Design a protein around this ligand. Structure first.
Ligand SMILES: [Mg+2]
Ligand SMILES: [Mg+2]
Ligand SMILES: [Mg+2]
Ligand SMILES: [Mg+2]
Ligand SMILES: [Mg+2]
Ligand SMILES: [Mg+2]
Ligand SMILES: [Mg+2]
Ligand SMILES: [Mg+2]
Ligand SMILES: [Mg+2]
Ligand SMILES: [Mg+2]
Ligand SMILES: [Mg+2]
Ligand SMILES: [Mg+2]
Ligand SMILES: [Mg+2]
Ligand SMILES: [Mg+2]
Ligand SMILES: [Mg+2]
Ligand SMILES: [Mg+2]
Lengths: 151, 55, 145, 71, 184, 53, 24, 107, 140, 73, 196
RNA sequence: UAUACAAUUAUCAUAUUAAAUUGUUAAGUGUUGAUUUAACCAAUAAAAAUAUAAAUAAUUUUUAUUUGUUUUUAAACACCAUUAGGUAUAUGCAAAUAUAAAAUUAUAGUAAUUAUAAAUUAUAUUAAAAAGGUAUUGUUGCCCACCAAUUUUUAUAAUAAAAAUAACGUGCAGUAAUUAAUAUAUUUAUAAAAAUAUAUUUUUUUUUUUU
């Protein structure tokens, strides 16, 4: 099972998708979280960190055990992989929920910075300066269609 | 009226089996339907290609 | 009335065709109406005119107006043509009924004037349909022997 | 068949028999026979709206002959 | 678990699975046997088989059996399919009658043509052209001609084609004998 | 027809099967060449492609 | 429901049954 | 003349459409023992009632098999087997018509 | 030229159009013909005029004294229909009338159900047949 | 929603006859000429005194196949 | 005049009010369309929109009728080909070209036969277009919903039997062996729906 | 602000002159094993056929009666979940499209409408010929829900309901649309929705007058 998601993502998504992925770990499946679409490497890991620090928060309360497997920090892919505990004999012999921590993060971070700097391309896409029409509803002042104030 | 059946059995059976074979290999040349022919690979390819079409 | 309709000859090719509704009349007892869809304005005008001369109706003026109510509907347009002391009608319907030389007719389209459907086309086709359903008194008398 | 429905009368369906038989251009109609119904027939035949009519002293019905002119 | 005989999994071959009923001689199939053919001496069983199969296929029995014996379908889809089948039949019948009513006219024009040939060449001549033995001096000629006609009239066994069964992926129809798409 | 002669029939299938296996090869029809669609406007018909037979 | 039409769809067909339902 | 035959079968046959005539049951079925659809072999409704009832009874008494037509060959005399050599002006067979057309044209 | 088609219909498409030599029915046909030429009438209207024209009281019951299945002989019809085109000035060269009226009938003689016609395609209507398949047409 | 191709131009199968029927033209032309302002065509000059038959009615208006509508056909 | 009354100068002549609002209908019925081809809605033959119709559904099986090129197709010579096949299979010492002569005779005739049948069939297409086909103008009869009114008549009946109550209702399907698996006191066969 | 439905034919929830209800039949062992499936995993496999006639038409059943939910698996299929099971189809309860109605939405104060069907849209093995569009120079077309702000009415249910609405983020539900859709039923749930049981075409058709 592989979950691919974008760089810009709501708190909402983080919540329900976290619960999903953990529910998938509980059933013994392969789990890999992947960002193949990103503005910056830094952002990409911002979200990997978000999703993971939500995941342990939720999966520790329902107490399902999995160990962190693989961090691939790369030009076109920013990804982490988790492996479940095989049996209740595996849960009692090794009882751990094992995650990366500041060292592994920051290290594969600088590794992504250098890996991406070497290829000369720092992201698949970047945000565009376009402003779509936006209503704010009730306002205290004059506002143009894009949601900006009148000088 | 019943059946003529030629004369000797094996000489008839040879013919029947021959023409069954010829029909088998004139059959094998008929176009199948796209769906029968293609794998699940290109099914999923065309699926994503369709979902994303709005861009 | 004049109007514009888009006519698609192909998925690329698009023409602008126009649409005419008119009525030919002479107060001496003969009128007719026509409509057409053509490429140009002049074209649709001429087409509508020969379509209106194809459909010419006449009216027996011995009686000068209908002697009984005619209740008749054109497509979706319910029309009442009834005897009156004078000519009473919508301005357009009125000079259509004048085109026939009716003195005593009176006529109403669709109960309330706000009732759907209402188009200039409908207004014309209605009164012409109604008049075309009208029976002369002589004809009625022979009809009963 | 129910409450909200109209309550029909021999006159009501006498008229509608004749109307529908006139639309289908029939020569004869069999029609309900009551006092005012065959009264109505005699009056219509007076004015010549109807070719003829007869009551056979049949209880239910009697018959009317329709007239067409100029098609 | 217990399966019917026309079920997919019916007669299984596995370490657990064991076939049910008396399987030989006087058997489980005793009064359940739809067809029986005594093989005529010196007749290959391939003609027998293709006769049986042509029969079943043309009368749409093999259609039915294949259809019902594979998947379940609600009585509504069964009705829809059967009545659709029957109404398509009705339509095509009313087409056939038209064709036939025309072909009898064509056949008439032909017979008429034959009449005109008759009064161009005379009746007897035309009969000559059609194989009339006016040259038959004695019975031996007659018996030669009629021996010819005998050797024509004797019917060699017809090998009638049975359309193959098409196995598709998830099997929307196991009635599938062609690759055309169908309305389920 | 030129050169007719009275010579006798041979044994059916005198020819030994070729070294290339025709059996192990799978037949491709629809995607074989590349095509250009003449579709002018609208969504392509779902029954031809995009629909299980 | 949404109070407006999300789609701009005008069919031009006028089946005689839809219009005069008194007679059909 | 009969779109749905009220003529088929002729009267005598009804007598034997009971449970104890396997033969006369059989002349109205297929070679598998199933009935023909109405628009294939049309039967007077009486005959259909009597027939499905018969086959039912006969089956539960053991006088007719649950599948198959045991009299299939014997019954062929009773069915109108139509020779391709004669022409019945009324057929839904489109083959036979064109066959005779062929024949005469070739003549 | 469509005139010849019309006349073909009056001749061959009508069972029992009375005795067509009689000056009465003859005048009916004459007038209607001159009204199909010069466009004063639709072909359909003139045909329905012809078959609905007034002939003689108790027409069918006098028809039982001549005809079995109500099909009269077609000679009077064709002789009258040629006569009318000759006496009216229809053609510049006299023979052409008769020839065309004759020829168009002879060609249709070979057709399946030759003297019956579908009522919609028989005459002018909104939807028509292609010029090859039109009935007494020169292009068949 | 699939429909037979030409339903757009489909004729009215009940009423398409009315337009062409001889009586209609007799009445219409009758009140046209009555005006004094129209020169009567000659067919009118003729059928003026030989008006068409009365009781011939179509099958569209009368839904009876067994009705023998025409004295002629 | 010089052409049809249902077709004027610019296209099909627009009679009903549908034509004036939607005048694409006058000039385009499809990709088989030409200008002479308006008012004749069927287009030429072998051409797009050339197919004749029968009660509204088009006739696309014509060859299958005369038995040229069909699976059910009529075969001219069988006895010959079988006879010759038998000859080939029996022995190699004697070779019979007599059989191959009877056969090639048979074929030589077959050619002309087939051209005849094809010609007669095209005449049938012409006749069918003139005297039968409605030119796609009438409603389909060939699919069950077109007959809905018929089925309605039957549902109505099963309702009046039920005291005019359950419309479209049918008996609950029970089980493969509902009758013999149920104890005394419970319904062993499916009842009328009103009876439940 | 007042100022004239229909009554010959109108599809969602106020039924009504009706003949049913009850039937104890079938099926099962020889032996050493790759069946089913596009693909996984559990693991004996065979099976449950019969009823017409008759019941009279209308006038005070509307608090009465009535519209596919059903004991028994030590019996299966089927379906649901997954090597550990659940369930496996009218003895409780249960009015309800077969139409009596007055412009759309909305619990009957919210927005200003809505709904709709035949024009147009290139590939379905005939001796080339049958096909659909919620789009409207038309699939690079439109649309669908959750997920923020705000606006406004109220009959405040995890977190009230409803209506306006132009962000952000998920997807890809719908236009026969990548396992056809639609309605009811029951279950399921990030969100459109999905699984199963029935009806059904506002889905595209493939056609044995005793073989
Ligand atoms: Mg208004
Ligand atoms: Mg179990
Ligand atoms: Mg709208
Ligand atoms: Mg549309
Ligand atoms: Mg659709
Ligand atoms: Mg179309
Ligand atoms: Mg087309
Ligand atoms: Mg109600
Ligand atoms: Mg509020
Ligand atoms: Mg709210
Ligand atoms: Mg989708
Ligand atoms: Mg779906
Ligand atoms: Mg779908
Ligand atoms: Mg649904
Ligand atoms: Mg969901
Ligand atoms: Mg649902």
């Amino acid at each position: 099972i592989d979950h691919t998601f974008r760089d810009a993502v709501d708190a909402h998504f983080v919540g329900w998708r976290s619960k999903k992925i953990v529910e998938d770990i509980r059933r013994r499946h392969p789990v890999k979280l992947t960002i193949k679409e990103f503005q910056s490497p830094e952002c990409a890991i911002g979200k990997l960190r978000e999703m993971c620090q939500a995941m342990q928060h939720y999966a520790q309360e329902k107490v399902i055990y999995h160990h962190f497997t693989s961090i691939v920090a790369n030009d076109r892919e920013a990804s982490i992989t988790f492996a479940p505990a095989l049996p209740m004999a595996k849960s009692d012999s090794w009882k751990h929920i094992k995650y990366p921590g500041e060292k592994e993060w920051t290290n594969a971070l600088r590794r992504m910075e250098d890996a991406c700097r070497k290829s000369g391309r720092y992201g698949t896409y970047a945000k565009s300066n376009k402003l779509k029409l936006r209503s704010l509803g009730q306002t205290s002042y004059r506002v143009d269609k894009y949601g900006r104030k009148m000088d | 009226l019943k059946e003529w059946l030629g004369d000797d059995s094996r000489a008839l059976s040879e013919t029947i089996d021959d023409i069954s074979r010829e029909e088998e290999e004139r059959e094998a040349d008929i176009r199948v339907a796209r769906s029968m022919e293609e794998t699940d690979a290109e099914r999923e390819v065309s699926r994503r290609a369709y979902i994303e079409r709005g861009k | 009335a004049y109007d514009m309709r888009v006519v698609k000859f192909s998925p690329k090719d698009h023409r602008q065709w126009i649409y005419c509704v008119l009525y030919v009349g002479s107060g001496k007892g003969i009128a007719g109406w026509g409509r057409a869809v053509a490429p140009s304005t002049q074209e649709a005008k001429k087409e509508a005119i020969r379509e209106a001369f194809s459909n010419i109706i006449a009216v027996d003026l011995e009686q000068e107006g209908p002697m009984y109510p005619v209740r008749v509907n054109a497509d979706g347009v319910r029309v009442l043509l009834y005897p009156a002391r004078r000519i009473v009608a919508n301005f357009r319907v009125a000079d259509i009924l004048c085109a026939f030389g009716f003195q005593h007719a009176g006529c109403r389209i669709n109960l309330k004037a706000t009732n759907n459907p209402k188009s200039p086309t409908h207004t014309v086709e209605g009164v012409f349909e109604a008049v075309k359903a009208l029976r002369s008194v002589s004809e009625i008398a022979a009809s009963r022997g | 068949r129910r409450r909200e429905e109209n309550l029909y009368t021999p006159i009501y369906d006498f008229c509608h028999r004749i109307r529908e038989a006139t639309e289908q251009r029939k020569r004869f109609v069999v029609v309900p026979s009551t006092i005012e119904t065959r009264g109505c027939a005699r009056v219509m035949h007076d004015h010549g709206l109807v070719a003829g009519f007869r009551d056979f002293h049949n209880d239910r019905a009697f018959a009317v002959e329709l007239k067409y002119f100029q098609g | 678990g217990g399966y019917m005989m026309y079920h997919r999994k019916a007669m299984g071959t596995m370490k657990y699975s064991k076939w049910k009923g008396a399987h030989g001689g006087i058997s489980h199939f005793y009064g359940r046997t739809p067809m029986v053919e005594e093989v005529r001496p010196n007749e290959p069983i391939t003609l027998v088989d293709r006769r049986i199969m042509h029969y079943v296929h043309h009368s749409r029995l093999r259609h039915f059996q294949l259809f019902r014996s594979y998947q379940e379908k609600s009585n509504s889809t069964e009705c829809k399919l059967r009545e659709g089948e029957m109404l398509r039949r009705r339509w095509h019948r009313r087409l056939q009658k038209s064709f036939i009513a025309f072909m009898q006219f064509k056949t008439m024009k032909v017979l008429e043509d034959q009449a005109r040939l008759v009064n161009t060449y005379g009746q007897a001549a035309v009969n000559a052209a059609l194989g009339d033995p006016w040259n038959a001096t004695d019975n031996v000629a007659r018996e030669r001609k009629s021996a010819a006609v005998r050797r024509q009239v004797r019917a060699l066994p017809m090998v009638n084609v049975v359309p193959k069964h098409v196995a598709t992926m998830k099997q929307i129809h196991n009635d599938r004998f062609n690759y055309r798409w169908r309305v389920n | 027809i030129s050169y007719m002669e009275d010579v006798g029939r041979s044994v059916k299938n005198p020819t030994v099967p070729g070294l290339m296996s025709t059996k192990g090869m799978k037949k491709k029809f629809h995607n074989l060449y590349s095509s250009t669609s003449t579709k002018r406007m609208g969504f392509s018909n779902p029954t031809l492609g995009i629909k299980k037979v | 429901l949404k109070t407006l039409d999300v789609r701009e769809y005008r069919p031009l067909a006028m089946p005689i049954e839809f219009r005069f339902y008194q007679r059909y | 003349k009969d779109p749905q035959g009220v003529q088929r079968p002729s009267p005598e046959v009804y007598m034997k459409l009971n449970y104890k005539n396997p033969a006369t049951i059989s002349r109205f079925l297929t070679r598998t023992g199933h009935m023909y659809p109405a628009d294939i072999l049309p039967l007077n409704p009486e005959a259909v009632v009597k027939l499905r009832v018969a086959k039912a009874q006969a089956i539960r008494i053991g006088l007719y098999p649950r599948f198959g037509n045991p009299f299939w060959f014997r019954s062929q005399k009773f069915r109108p087997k139509a020779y391709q050599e004669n022409y019945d002006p009324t057929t839904y067979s489109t083959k036979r018509t064109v066959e005779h057309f062929a024949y005469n044209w070739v003549q | 030229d469509d005139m010849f088609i019309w006349l073909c219909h009056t001749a061959m498409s009508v069972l029992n159009p009375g005795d067509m030599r009689s000056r009465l029915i003859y005048n009916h046909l004459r007038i209607l013909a001159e009204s199909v030429a010069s466009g004063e009438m639709t072909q359909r209207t003139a045909f329905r005029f012809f078959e609905s024209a007034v002939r003689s009281p108790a027409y069918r019951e006098i028809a039982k004294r001549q005809l079995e299945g109500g099909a009269a002989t077609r000679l009077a019809g064709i002789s009258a229909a040629a006569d009318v085109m000759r006496r009216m000035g229809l053609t510049r060269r006299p023979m052409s009338s008769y020839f065309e009226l004759y020829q168009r009938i002879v060609e249709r003689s070979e057709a399946m159900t030759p003297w019956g016609f579908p009522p919609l395609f028989q005459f002018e209507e909104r939807l028509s047949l292609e010029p090859r398949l039109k009935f007494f047409s020169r292009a068949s | 929603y699939k429909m037979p191709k030409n339903m757009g131009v489909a004729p009215r199968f009940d009423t398409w006859n009315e337009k062409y029927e001889p009586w209609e033209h007799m009445k219409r032309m009758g009140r046209l000429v009555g005006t004094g302002f129209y020169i009567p065509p000659e067919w009118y000059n003729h059928f003026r005194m030989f008006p068409p038959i009365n009781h011939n009615f179509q099958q569209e208006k009368t839904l009876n196949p067994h009705n023998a509508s025409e004295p002629t056909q | 005049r010089q052409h049809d009354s249902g077709v004027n100068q610019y296209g099909l002549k627009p009679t009903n009010a549908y034509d004036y609002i939607n005048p694409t209908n006058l000039i385009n019925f499809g990709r088989g369309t030409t200008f002479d081809n308006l008012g004749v809605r069927r287009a030429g033959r072998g051409e797009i929109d050339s197919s004749p119709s029968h009660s509204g559904s088009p006739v696309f099986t014509q060859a299958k009728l005369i038995g040229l090129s069909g699976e059910e197709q009529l075969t001219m010579c069988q006895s010959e080909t079988m006879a010759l096949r038998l000859c080939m299979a029996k022995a190699g010492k004697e070779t019979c070209e007599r059989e191959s002569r009877a056969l090639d005779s048979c074929l030589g005739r077959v050619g002309h036969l087939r051209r005849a049948m094809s010609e007669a069939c095209w005449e049938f297409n012409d006749w069918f277009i003139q005297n039968v086909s409605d030119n796609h103008t009438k409603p389909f009869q060939h699919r069950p919903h077109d007959w809905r009114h018929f089925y309605a008549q039957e549902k109505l009946v099963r309702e009046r039997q039920q005291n005019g109550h359950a419309y479209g209702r049918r008996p609950k399907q029970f089980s493969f062996g509902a009758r013999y698996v149920k104890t005394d006191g419970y319904g062993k066969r499916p009842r009328l729906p009103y009876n439940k």
